[PDB]
């Protein structure tokens, strides 16, 4: 609802430390980390998809990273 | 002007024991539009101000201990305490919120036997 | 965290009017219906009067109907009760009850004030 | 001396033209400007004190559902209608239910159903703008008088407040002169794009568009009773279980979710006086009218005694606390910085002119010795006290620290950082223009992306630049990748 | 907890309507749409990245769409 | 008319018309009633003059009434002096956008 749209990166940046700048920094990363630890099969699915949609190694790496970053972020 | 009649007037029970208080209505306090039953149970601790234990017939209020649970459907409602502690001394005034001139019951009293 | 503190309670002779005041804090007052409740010594809890969220709408208990008046100074975050033609029966500890935070009833009690004592005697 | 030991102090030494020098007063930091013959003095922004705030929106968090009512109708008999629909307070949602002869209806099929419930709001959230005709910045100016009780004092200074309409001021320093301020308060922060919301005795400086985007039921905010809330469906949740009946919930209090949804906002002190304590401001200092107050004095002719052992500040300068002993007059303090055995004058005085005022109060001479083994002599006579202090670090370390400080400044101020301590140089204007164009492109491209996203995109762009065989592509992508990494590293705060 | 670990796809599936199904079916899609309409330049940046990484008409589109899904929701 | 010689005071803060022209409403507060107003738009950190008036000739017809000036400043930061000398008030207004 409201939590999905944090006031991050809007543009107004100043010297003074912002609200929850220590805790709310790695929140998104920890979400993905916990999701990956909880659901391991999608790792295999993403590896298969990256191998079969990427003709270059860099393409495979980018596709795998984006797939890992998109699904827990989506839900 | 629904009058609330409570079955027990004094409940002396030993600690670590159950207890059943009854608050019988003169009319079913079941609001037709939503199907809910507006019966509230307060407790005024001696030398204190009344609290709110179960803000419905069976949905207990916040901050209330685990043991306080209610029941009843149309006119015969109950307040069940699972294990009585030494803090349960007080006056368990029931109440009906169905109608605007809401009236409390006489209120039972609980003491340690 | 909400705090409802009573004020105005004192001794008074029969027939002399009195104005009670309920000071409120810890929540937005203008959105909450407020109540007045009394407990005569050794007697069951007896609700007196209610004022809803809109200032105009008020109701009184029939036992005290026509003798009291309830007012809301929400700009100052306080409640006002006007007691007129007081009777020696109309002596009790008076409470100030907030509207329910969560529920379905438009009027209910969840937090009770500390309580004030008014004595009507000669 | 008010800006001694702060840890964010930055020096400004150059002067040009009419001795006008511009400085950007970041709120946390504090600028200590100095000159060849002017009284060295340190400056900071105290508070900006937004006043007379006008509200324009109340958005709710805690609702309360009352008077749930339902109507249902037979199949092919139209939608259910309820008289409570034509009321502002009522939120009502249709649905479909199934019923046959068991529900009293002869026709078999799907039937309509409505459920209206009056929605009451408890504890709204106010959002208030600030108009520029009611904003009062406040600048405190302190001279390095060498006073006894001045070393780190936070209450000794000359207040010179500025408003956007009354931009310029003149702060008369006591017995020093007049530090003319040609400051520019309009370019500091754009409060037109920022509206100040306050909830439950707290405040934050959120972006206006972000406030207008978040999904909570707002209202006109005209301070009238019984406000009507738009988009009430964001709190109520109707739950048709088995296509048998419908139910209403109020979804509870959004306070914790709202606190999370303010992860990048800056908190301010609305409590008390709506005093904003975050921001920055740029100003220029006209030091033409200042006077040293110490040129006409004579040299102190007798010995000194130091009270507090020499303590070294975080920025490498030396702070000394001497007290006059012998002679009875206000006199200029002799000072020299010789090396261990070579008499090379290399130590500068951060204080413009040390002068004993009364002889009963100690002086607070601060100096910046050259790194190495250097002696300090603070007396005209042979009985002068000698202080030897060994400084650590090298010019390489100072250059690295200055480069890091400048990069961190440019990562915050951005365009404004190019004229932080500018003396009006012709090349500096060109550099500022180039940085302005590039930053205007960069923030337009990168607006609204996370710090981790910036790091990922930057490393990807660096990889692309390294791989590509095109010189232009390689150079541009590598430069943008390095810039994006360094920005994303420091963005969060 | 924080509204970043919803119970969307994991676990049980029943015939009854799960709590807040219709309200939250399109929640993340609306979030992505409003973020994209509020910050348009990242569309240009994503187009650049896709057209300059591993280009083939299927990869060039999948990488673009995947990145445009990652960045807003990740935020 | 002659040139005025007294300090001014702002009544309403400067605001931008959507064509990048600033309305300025000033109060004379001076004893020589009909003397006209000097207006000099000093550019950023310098004495350069790249802006111009749009109100052809601003004159205080009466001491009491506040006359409203029109200025079209340079695109960048600019300080628009609207007084005579050292007591001249300095209006600082920053314009967004380029040529
Ligand atoms: C929303 O939902 C709430 C609660 O869910 C409804 O609240 C109702 O409020 C009204 C007043 O605003 C209440 O009316 C009271 O009814 C009492 C019932 O007494 C008899 O009821 C029968 C019906 O069974 C009638 O036929 C008789 O004629 C009687 O009225 C009535 O006794 C009482 O009047 C007495 O008290 C008042 C105040 O003390 C005195 O001034 C009066 O002279 C008399 O002594 C009231 O009229 C009603 O009971 C409430 N209903 C419920 C379920 O709580 C709202 O109406 C709903 N709608 C809106 C828009 O809010
Ligand atoms: C910061 O600066 C202020 C102001 O200069 C300092 O306040 C000063 O505090 C001293 C006490 O430490 C005061 O001395 C007192 O004076 C009175 C009257 O002369 C006397 O009766 C007392 O016995 C005592 O000697 C001094 O007056 C006061 N100065 C003022 C009020 O202007 C302060 O100490 C400095 N430092 C800090 C950390 O605040």
DSSP for D13-59?
A: ----TTTEEEEEEESS--EEE--SSS--EEEEEEE--B-S-EEEEEE
Distance (Å) from the alpha carbon of B49 to chain D's nearest alpha carbon: 24
Distance separating alpha carbons of residues D126 and D218, to the nearest angstrom: 9
- Up-side HSE of residue A35: CA atoms within 13 Å toward CB? 24
- Residue F57: which H helix or E strand, with range? none
Nearest to D257, CA basis, from D65, D120, D59: D59
- With contact defined as 3+ CB pairs under 8 Å, the chains touching A are D, E
What are the b/e assignments for F6-38, b being 16+ CB within 10 Å? ebbebeebbeeeeeeebbbebbbebeeeebebe
Distance separating alpha carbons of residues E59 and B29, to the nearest angstrom: 66
What is the distance, to the nearest Å, from the Cα of residue D8 to the centroid of all Cα atoms in its chain?
13
Cβ of D328: how many Cβ atoms within 10 Å?
A: 9
- Atom from ligand 1 closest to the CA of residue B98: 54
**Max Cα separation, chain E?**
48
For ligand 2, the distance from its centroid to the CA atom of residue D352, given in whole angstroms, is 25
Q: What number of residues does chain B have?
A: 113
**Cβ contact B82:B15 at 8 Å:** no
Nearest to F6, CA basis, from F81, F67, F85, F59: F85
Judged by its nearest atom, the ligand closest to the C-alpha of residue D154 is 2
Distance separating alpha carbons of residues E52 and D473, to the nearest angstrom: 10
C55–D120 C-beta distance less than 8 A = no
Q: What number of residues does chain C have?
A: 122
Q: How is chain F split among helix, strand and coil, in percent rounded to 5?
A: 0, 40, 60
Structure tokens at D260: 């999370």
Judged by its nearest atom, the ligand closest to the C-alpha of residue D152 is 2
**Cβ contact F8:F83 at 8 Å:** yes
What are the b/e assignments for D330-357, b being 16+ CB within 10 Å? ebbbbbebbbeeeeeeebebbbbbbbbe
The DSSP bridge partners found for residue D285 are D21, D181
Structure tokens at D160: 């010179």
Question: In D272-379, where does DSSP find H-type helix?
Answer: none
Query: Does C26 lie at the interface with D, CB-CB under 8 angstroms?
Result: no
Nearest to C64, CA basis, from C89, C42, C41, C43: C89
> Resolution (in Å) of the shown entry?
3.5
Burial of B98 (0-12, 13-18, 19+ CB in 10 A): middle
The DSSP bridge partners found for residue B22 are B78
C27–D122 C-beta distance less than 8 A = yes
**Cβ contact D450:E67 at 8 Å:** no
- Up-side HSE of residue B26: CA atoms within 13 Å toward CB? 10
Interface A-E, measured as beta-carbon pairs within 8 A, has a size of 72
The DSSP annotation for D85-113 comes to GSSSSEEEEEEEEEE-GGGT-SS-EEEEE
Distance separating alpha carbons of residues C77 and C54, to the nearest angstrom: 14
Q: Give F53's contacts (C-beta < 8 A, 6+ positions apart).
A: F39, F69, F70, F71, F72
The DSSP code for E69 is H
E54: nearest CB among A4, A6, A54: A54
Residue with tokens 């009777």: C87
Distance separating alpha carbons of residues D23 and D269, to the nearest angstrom: 26
- Up-side HSE of residue D181: CA atoms within 13 Å toward CB? 29
Instruction: Report the sign of the C-alpha dihedral through residues D357, D360, D361, D367, in that order.
Output: positive
What are the b/e assignments for B65-74, b being 16+ CB within 10 Å? eeebbbebee
- Taking the CA atoms of residue C63, residue C66, residue C67 and residue C69 in that order, the dihedral angle to the nearest 10 degrees is 110
Structure tokens at B20: 């059943």
D123: nearest CB among C28, C53, C105: C28
Nearest to D205, CA basis, from E38, A22, A18: A18
Query: Does D66 lie at the interface with C, CB-CB under 8 angstroms?
Result: yes
Structure tokens at C20: 């009670």
Angle between helices E59-74 and D451-467 (to 10 degrees): 150
User: Using alpha carbons only, what angle is made at residue D78 by residues D73 and D81, rounded to the nearest 5 degrees?
Assistant: 65
Distance separating alpha carbons of residues D2 and D23, to the nearest angstrom: 17
Burial of A44 (0-12, 13-18, 19+ CB in 10 A): exposed
D66–C105 C-beta distance less than 8 A = yes
Q: Give E65's contacts (C-beta < 8 A, 6+ positions apart).
A: none
The bridge status of strand C11-12 relative to strand D248-249 is unpaired
B31 lines ligand 1 (CB under 6 A): yes
**Cβ contact D340:D375 at 8 Å:** yes
The DSSP bridge partners found for residue C86 are none
- Taking the CA atoms of residue E49, residue E54, residue E55 and residue E59 in that order, the dihedral angle to the nearest 10 degrees is -90
What are the b/e assignments for D158-190, b being 16+ CB within 10 Å? bebbbbbbebbbebebeebbebbbbbbbbbbbe
**Cβ contact E25:D196 at 8 Å:** no
The DSSP bridge partners found for residue D324 are D304
For ligand 2, the distance from its centroid to the CA atom of residue D110, given in whole angstroms, is 85
Distance separating alpha carbons of residues C9 and B64, to the nearest angstrom: 31
**Cβ contact A38:D271 at 8 Å:** no
Angle between helices D451-467 and A57-74 (to 10 degrees): 170
For ligand 2, the distance from its centroid to the CA atom of residue E53, given in whole angstroms, is 68
User: Using alpha carbons only, what angle is made at residue D277 by residues D275 and D278, rounded to the nearest 5 degrees?
Assistant: 135
Nearest to B39, CA basis, from B109, B94, B81, B91: B94
Q: Tell me the chain E residues in contact with residue A25 when contact means C-beta distances shorter than 8 Å.
A: none
The DSSP bridge partners found for residue D283 are D23
**Cβ contact D286:D272 at 8 Å:** no
Nearest to D77, CA basis, from D113, D29, D37: D113
Q: Which CA distances in Å does D186 have to D41, D163, D192, D280, E58?
A: 25, 9, 11, 11, 50
Residue with tokens 């994303």: D488
**Cβ contact B2:B37 at 8 Å:** no
Which residues of chain B from 8 to 47 reach within 8 Å of chain D, CB to CB? 33-34
Cβ of C5: how many Cβ atoms within 10 Å?
A: 15
User: Using alpha carbons only, what angle is made at residue C36 by residues C30 and C39, rounded to the nearest 5 degrees?
Assistant: 155
Q: Give E57's contacts (C-beta < 8 A, 6+ positions apart).
A: none
Question: What's the start-to-end Cα distance of chain A, in Å?
Answer: 13
Nearest to A10, CA basis, from D479, B20, C84, D193: D193
Q: Which CA distances in Å does D226 have to C34, D232, D305?
A: 16, 14, 74
Q: Tell me the chain D residues in contact with residue F10 when contact means C-beta distances shorter than 8 Å.
A: 165-166
Instruction: Report the sign of the C-alpha dihedral through residues D94, D100, D101, D102, in that order.
Output: negative
The bridge status of strand B51-54 relative to strand B39-43 is antiparallel
Q: Tell me the chain B residues in contact with residue C110 when contact means C-beta distances shorter than 8 Å.
A: 52, 55, 61
Q: Give C81's contacts (C-beta < 8 A, 6+ positions apart).
A: C19, C20, C21, C22, C36, C48, C49, C68, C69, C70, C71, C94
**Cβ contact C34:C72 at 8 Å:** yes
Q: Give E25's contacts (C-beta < 8 A, 6+ positions apart).
A: none
Question: In D155-299, where does DSSP find H-type helix?
Answer: 208-213, 255-260
Distance separating alpha carbons of residues D158 and D174, to the nearest angstrom: 9
Nearest to D127, CA basis, from D225, D206, D48, D189: D206
**Cβ contact C16:B78 at 8 Å:** no
To test the pocket of ligand 1, the residue of C48, C52, C59, C100 to mutate (highest count of ligand atoms within 8 Å of its CB) is: C59
Nearest to D300, CA basis, from D224, D344, D365, D241: D365
Residue with tokens 């105005």: C8
Instruction: Report the sign of the C-alpha dihedral through residues D467, D468, D472, D476, in that order.
Output: negative
């Amino acid at each position: 609802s409201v939590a999905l749209a944090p006031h991050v990166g809007m543009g107004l940046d100043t010297r003074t430390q912002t609200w929850m700048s220590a805790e709310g920094a790695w929140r998104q990363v920890e979400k993905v980390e916990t999701w990956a630890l909880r659901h391991p099969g999608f790792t295999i699915l993403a590896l298969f998809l990256a191998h079969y949609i990427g003709t270059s190694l860099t393409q495979k790496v980018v596709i795998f990273i984006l797939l890992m970053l998109v699904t827990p972020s989506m839900t | 002007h629904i009058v609330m009649t409570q079955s027990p007037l004094s409940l002396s029970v030993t600690p670590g024991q159950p207890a059943s208080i009854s608050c019988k209505s003169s009319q079913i306090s079941s609001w037709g539009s939503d199907g809910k039953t507006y019966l509230y149970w307060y407790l005024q601790k001696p030398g204190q101000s009344p609290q709110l234990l179960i803000y419905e017939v069976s949905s207990r209020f916040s901050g209330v201990s685990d043991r306080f649970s209610g029941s009843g459907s149309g006119t015969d409602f109950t307040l069940k305490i699972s294990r009585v502690q030494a803090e349960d001394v007080g006056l368990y005034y029931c109440m009906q919120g169905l109608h605007l001139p809401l009236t409390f019951g006489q209120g039972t009293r609980l003491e340690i036997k | 965290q909400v705090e409802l503190v009573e004020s105005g309670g004192d001794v008074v002779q029969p027939g002399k009017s009195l104005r009670l005041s309920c000071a409120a804090s810890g929540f937005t007052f203008t959105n909450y219906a407020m109540h007045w409740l009394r407990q005569a010594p050794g007697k069951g809890l007896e609700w007196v009067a209610v004022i809803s969220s809109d200032v105009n709408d008020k109701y009184y208990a029939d036992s005290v109907k026509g003798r009291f008046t309830i007012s809301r100074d929400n700009s100052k975050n306080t409640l006002y009760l006007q007691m007129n033609s007081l009777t020696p029966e109309d002596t009790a500890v008076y409470y100030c009850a907030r509207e329910q935070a969560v529920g379905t009833n438009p009027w209910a009690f969840d937090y009770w004030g500390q309580g004030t004592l008014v004595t009507v005697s000669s | 001396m008010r800006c001694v030991g702060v840890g964010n102090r930055d020096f400004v030494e150059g002067l040009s033209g009419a001795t006008w020098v511009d400085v950007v007063l970041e709120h946390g930091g504090c600028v200590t400007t100095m000159a060849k013959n002017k009284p060295t003095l340190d400056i900071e922004l105290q508070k900006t004190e937004a006043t007379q705030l006008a509200t324009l929106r109340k958005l709710c968090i805690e609702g309360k559902i009352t008077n749930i009512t339902t109507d249902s109708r037979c199949p092919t008999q139209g939608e259910a209608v309820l008289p409570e629909e034509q009321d502002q307070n009522y939120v009502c949602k249709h649905t479909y239910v199934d019923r046959g002869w068991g529900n009293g209806c002869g026709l078999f099929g799907k039937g309509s159903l409505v459920t209206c419930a009056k929605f009451q709001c408890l504890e709204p959230i106010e959002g208030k703008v600030v108009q520029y005709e009611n904003l009062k910045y406040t600048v405190i100016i302190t001279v390095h008088t060498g006073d006894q009780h001045q070393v780190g004092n936070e209450t000794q200074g000359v207040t010179a407040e500025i408003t956007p309409q009354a931009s310029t001021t003149e702060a008369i320093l006591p017995e020093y002169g007049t530090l003319g301020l040609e400051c520019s308060p309009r370019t500091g922060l754009d409060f037109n794009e920022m509206i100040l919301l306050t909830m439950k005795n707290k405040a934050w400086m959120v972006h206006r568009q972000w406030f207008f985007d978040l999904p909570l039921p707002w209202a006109s905010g005209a301070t009238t009773e019984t406000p009507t809330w738009n988009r009430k469906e964001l709190l109520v949740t109707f739950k048709n279980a088995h296509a048998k009946k419908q139910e209403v919930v109020v979804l509870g209090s959004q306070e914790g979710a709202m606190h999370t949804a303010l992860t990048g906002a800056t908190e301010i002190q609305n409590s008390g006086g709506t005093s904003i304590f975050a921001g920055h401001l740029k100003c220029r200092l006209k030091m033409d009218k200042l006077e040293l107050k110490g040129m006409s004095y004579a040299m102190c002719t007798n010995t000194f005694v130091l009270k507090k052992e020499v303590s070294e500040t975080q920025h490498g300068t030396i702070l000394i606390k001497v007290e006059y002993k012998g002679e009875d007059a206000p006199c200029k303090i002799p000072f020299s910085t010789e090396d261990g055995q070579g008499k090379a004058h290399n130590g500068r005085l951060i204080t413009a002119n040390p002068v004993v005022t009364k002889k009963e109060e100690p002086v607070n001479i601060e100096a910046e010795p050259p790194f190495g083994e250097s002696n300090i002599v603070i007396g005209i006579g042979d009985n002068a006290l000698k202080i030897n202090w060994y400084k650590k670090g090298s010019s390489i370390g100072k250059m690295f620290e200055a480069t890091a400080r400048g990069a961190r400044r440019m990562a915050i101020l951005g365009d404004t950082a190019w004229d932080f301590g500018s003396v009006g140089g012709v090349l500096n204007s060109l550099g500022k223009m180039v940085h302005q164009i590039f930053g205007s492109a960069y923030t337009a491209l990168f607006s609204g992306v996370s710090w981790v996203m910036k790091i990922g995109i930057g490393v990807l762009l660096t990889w692309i630049g390294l791989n590509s065989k095109n010189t232009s592509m390689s150079f541009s992508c590598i430069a943008i990748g390095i810039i994006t990494l360094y920005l994303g590293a420091v963005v969060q705060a």
